Amino acid sequence: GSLPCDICKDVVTAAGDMLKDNATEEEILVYLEKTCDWLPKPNMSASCKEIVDSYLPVILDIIKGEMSRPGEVCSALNLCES
Ligand SMILES: [Ca+2]
Structure with missing residues (x-):
């Protein structure tokens, strides 16, 4: 998707980093x-x-499941080419 794909990947990376930092789901939403x-x-x-x-x-x-990296997650959502 180019931009939607690029954004999706930045989002997944940032979400994972914040979860490790003990951020709440709302704090992640607000911050991204x-x-x-x-x-x-x-x-x-x-x-x-x-x-x-x-x-x-x-x-x-x-x-929270087996899939957690930007590429695999964004490809599953079809925001990045399969
Ligand atoms: Ca600015």
């Missing part, structure tokens, strides 16, 4: 949404926030 502001253009930051809102909760459920 704010990190989306690092994307240089308003439209890109906006699409990043929608991906975070739409996928972070399911990503948290997925990574």
Whole structure:
């Protein structure tokens, strides 16, 4: 998906790191949404926030299982080429 794929992978990486830091699921949601502001253009930051809102909760459920790396997780969600 290019951008949606790139964003998905950054999200999965960040979520995993925060979970290890004992962050709550809401703190992760709040933080990734704010990190989306690092994307240089308003439209890109906006699409990043929608991906975070739409996928972070399911990503948290997925990574509690056997699959936890960005590539494998984002390919499963079909945000990155299978
Ligand atoms: Ca900024």
